[PDB]
Enzyme design. Structure first.
Site, PDB file in Angstrom:
ATOM      1  N   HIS B  68       0.911  -1.290   0.555  1.00 49.00           N
ATOM      2  CA  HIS B  68      -0.409   0.223  -0.280  1.00 49.00           C
ATOM      3  C   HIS B  68       0.554   1.642  -0.263  1.00 49.00           C
ATOM      4  CE1 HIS B  68      -3.691  -2.693   0.819  1.00 49.00           C
ATOM      5  NE2 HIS B  68      -4.287  -0.961   0.290  1.00 49.00           N
ATOM      6  N   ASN B  69       1.787   1.219  -0.500  1.00 54.07           N
ATOM      7  CA  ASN B  69       2.572   2.427  -1.404  1.00 54.07           C
ATOM      8  C   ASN B  69       2.852   3.115  -2.223  1.00 54.07           C
ATOM      9  OD1 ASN B  69       4.153   1.213  -4.161  1.00 54.07           O
ATOM     10  ND2 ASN B  69       3.724  -0.540  -2.521  1.00 54.07           N
ATOM     11  N   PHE B  70       3.553   4.190  -2.937  1.00 53.83           N
ATOM     12  CA  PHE B  70       3.518   5.168  -3.383  1.00 53.83           C
ATOM     13  C   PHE B  70       2.998   4.774  -4.855  1.00 53.83           C
ATOM     14  CE2 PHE B  70       5.332   7.943  -7.492  1.00 53.83           C
ATOM     15  CZ  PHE B  70       4.094   8.887  -7.301  1.00 53.83           C
ATOM     16  N   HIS B  72       1.466   1.445  -5.738  1.00 56.35           N
ATOM     17  CA  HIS B  72       0.188   1.097  -5.895  1.00 56.35           C
ATOM     18  C   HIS B  72      -0.885   2.470  -6.190  1.00 56.35           C
ATOM     19  CE1 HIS B  72      -3.682  -0.927  -5.539  1.00 56.35           C
ATOM     20  NE2 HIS B  72      -4.285   0.518  -4.562  1.00 56.35           N
ATOM     21  N   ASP B 109      -5.513   6.529  -1.377  1.00 56.70           N
ATOM     22  CA  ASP B 109      -5.039   5.014  -0.436  1.00 56.70           C
ATOM     23  C   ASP B 109      -3.501   5.828   0.820  1.00 56.70           C
ATOM     24  OD1 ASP B 109      -5.651   2.573   0.308  1.00 56.70           O
ATOM     25  OD2 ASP B 109      -5.051   1.937  -1.697  1.00 56.70           O
ATOM     26  N   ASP B 218      -8.308  -0.208  -8.341  1.00 54.10           N
ATOM     27  CA  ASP B 218      -7.366  -0.239  -7.415  1.00 54.10           C
ATOM     28  C   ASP B 218      -7.548  -1.463  -7.248  1.00 54.10           C
ATOM     29  OD1 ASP B 218      -7.248   0.030  -4.575  1.00 54.10           O
ATOM     30  OD2 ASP B 218      -8.839   0.305  -3.402  1.00 54.10           O
ATOM     31  N   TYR B 240       0.199  -8.859   3.632  1.00 54.17           N
ATOM     32  CA  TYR B 240      -0.653  -9.011   4.832  1.00 54.17           C
ATOM     33  C   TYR B 240      -0.401 -10.309   5.791  1.00 54.17           C
ATOM     34  CZ  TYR B 240      -4.800  -8.317   1.852  1.00 54.17           C
ATOM     35  OH  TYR B 240      -6.215  -8.059   1.288  1.00 54.17           O
ATOM     36  N   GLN B 269      -5.031 -15.558  -5.454  1.00 48.36           N
ATOM     37  CA  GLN B 269      -5.194 -15.322  -6.574  1.00 48.36           C
ATOM     38  C   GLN B 269      -6.225 -15.851  -7.046  1.00 48.36           C
ATOM     39  OE1 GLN B 269      -3.912 -13.206  -4.974  1.00 48.36           O
ATOM     40  NE2 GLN B 269      -3.346 -11.740  -6.887  1.00 48.36           N
TER      41      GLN B 269
END
Ligand SMILES: C[C@@H](Nc1nc2c(cnn2C2CCCC2)c(=O)[nH]1)c1ccc(Cl)cc1
Ligand SMILES: C[C@@H](Nc1nc2c(cnn2C2CCCC2)c(=O)[nH]1)c1ccc(Cl)cc1
Ligand SMILES: [Mg+2]
Ligand SMILES: [Mg+2]
Ligand SMILES: [Zn+2]
Ligand SMILES: [Zn+2]
Lengths: 326, 322
Positions: B68-70, B72, B109, B218, B240, B269
């Site tokens: 959940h970073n830049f 993304h 985010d 997203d 996770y 997945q």
């Protein structure tokens, strides 16, 4: 002898079950003792193993986090909890509701306006206050009260729920949140309609019918000033308008839109209450009376009188105006 | 390095784009181009330096979580960019709606702490306690987004009338709060209710489409080429686990899809592609038939590949248990 003030005469304990109770007589000490007693007398201290020493600290902390605004202050906090108390008895609520729901109603009432700054969500939003930006224009005040309420209960020393299981606390938190958020007046129309739709065929079994009922009850208590005797309810109008005028001046002075019903130059004691009583208060309690017939005589009664009383007082204010260019 | 080649400018318009190549500076230059190119700089009188300072600030406020970073943030924005071209959205939406979609993708985010709402609530965190167990992250990101746009040196909206600000602010809030995966079921149903008889002139139908669009962008990692999409799955699980590792050593529940001992790249997945991604893109293709061949195509392949791989993972366990 004459015992101290924070020891309530059985005469007080008696009169506290009633909406005729005079909220103005007492000072913080006693209002807090009053509330404390509510929690014992409602069997909440017993049934949730509330530490009675915690219960006092909780209430001191709650008091401290209420601000000294003209209207949205600790005495309002008190009135609402006291009125919920009054209705627990009047509506035999302990029959219809689980002890958990009672706890939710009471605790919700107490916490519902925590750290209210003196200016409604329309100011918060239009002025783009920290709170409006923080809660994204969604009931920022009510969201804020709710937050504050649980910050307090997160302290071990103030945590009246400290000996509740986690499943229970979860369920209580969810309920208080719901109710406090419901106090937002923007949602009055919406909530009244949802309630009125369940009343077609009400069902005390149904959890969603009950959730509405609680939402309705806390709203009934939140705005209940005018149900109280004329002497008790008359000054609150001056408290309300004092605060509402604070905001409208600020709004004017910062170039922001200004609600006619808060305009120093338009609103009179009577014009504040007539419409509010006739069209918000009465119709609401009218519906509650269907579930609880006893409410007509205790609550609609004073409201009709207060309507009549103000409707006349407006005729006279207008008769006088007319005279001063006649 | 600093300047983008016309190849790259070209490539940026498609989902095929290799997000992994570029360093932060260059991604900011890419994002910057998206604004000029889509005609937002023009049609909203955005100061061209402010647009750069704003993007730099947006970058400052993303954290270095493994997922959940830049980047993304870049993936989602650049995918949205791709969807404007693929679906020819400039004909279906006003430029305001485009501005909202883009600016919301980018911000969606912000300041993500690395642990989802399910942890935030259960650990009863600052955020969860403040936002009242109500999309606390997605509320947060949103708030952060406007704390940035409130700084006047980062205010890409500074030359927009207060009316439009309001409509953008609303647009942006709705879309960011829609990214909450708790509301996937709700929002997908709301949308399919409309698809029964969709109506581009119904602001309500569009507010839902915009939602589905940002939602799409997203989670759209597996829509990209295998070389591009597989690194993200490791990144996702890195995160996770970091959470379930913390969830375990604090006695809080862990969901089995983040339990380091139950989960593989493949199990992660197969489910997601099948019952989340495909269904969503199937519906979005009923509005935009072109989508099938560009987006559903690689998804089916990915599903089929990971299912194949699951057969091998399982075969390995038939050699391990005792
Ligand atoms: C002027 C004001 N009158 C009024 N407002 C009241 C009372 C009690 N609470 N409130 C407000 C305080 C915030 C919760 C409604 C009350 O007794 N009278 C008013 C407010 C809203 C409308 Cl729609 C009409 C009148
Ligand atoms: C294990 C996880 N798989 C997964 N999750 C993904 C992806 C992209 N975003 N996300 C999550 C991360 C937070 C935004 C949704 C992805 O490609 N795969 C997963 C999560 C929920 C379900 Cl239902 C199924 C799998
Ligand atoms: Mg309030
Ligand atoms: Mg998110
Ligand atoms: Zn109140
Ligand atoms: Zn995301």
């Amino acid at each position: 002898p004459t015992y101290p003030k924070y020891l309530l005469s059985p005469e007080t304990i008696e009169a506290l079950r009633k909406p005729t109770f005079d909220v103005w007589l007492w000072e913080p000490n006693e209002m807090l003792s009053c509330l404390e007693h509510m929690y014992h007398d409602l069997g909440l201290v017993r049934d949730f193993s509330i530490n009675p020493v915690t219960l006092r600290r909780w209430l001191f902390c709650v008091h401290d986090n209420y601000r000294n605004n003209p209207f949205h202050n600790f005495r309002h906090c008190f009135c609402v909890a006291q009125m919920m108390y009054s209705m627990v008895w009047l509506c035999s609520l302990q029959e219809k509701f689980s002890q958990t729901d009672i706890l939710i109603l009471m605790t919700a009432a107490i916490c519902h306006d925590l750290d209210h700054p003196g200016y409604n969500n329309t100011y918060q939003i239009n002025a783009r206050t920290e709170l409006a930006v923080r809660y994204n224009d969604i009931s920022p005040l009510e969201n804020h009260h709710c937050a504050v309420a649980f910050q307090i209960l997160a302290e071990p020393e103030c945590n009246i729920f400290s000996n509740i299981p986690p499943d229970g606390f979860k369920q209580i938190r969810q309920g208080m949140i719901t109710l406090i958020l419901a106090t937002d007046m923007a949602r009055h129309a919406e909530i009244m309609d949802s309630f009125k739709e369940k009343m077609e065929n009400f069902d005390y079994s149904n959890e969603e019918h009950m959730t509405l009922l609680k939402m309705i009850l806390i709203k009934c208590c939140d705005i209940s000033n005018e149900v109280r005797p004329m002497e008790v309810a008359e000054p609150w109008v001056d408290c309300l308008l004092e605060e509402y005028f604070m905001q409208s001046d600020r709004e004017k002075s910062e170039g922001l839109p200004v609600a006619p019903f808060m305009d120093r130059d338009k609103v009179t004691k009577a014009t504040a209450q007539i419409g509010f009583i006739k069209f918000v208060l009465i119709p609401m309690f009218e519906t509650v009376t269907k579930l609880f017939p006893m409410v007509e005589e205790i609550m609609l009664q004073p409201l009709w009188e207060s309507r009549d009383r103000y409707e006349e007082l407006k005729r006279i204010d207008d008769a006088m105006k007319e005279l001063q260019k006649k």
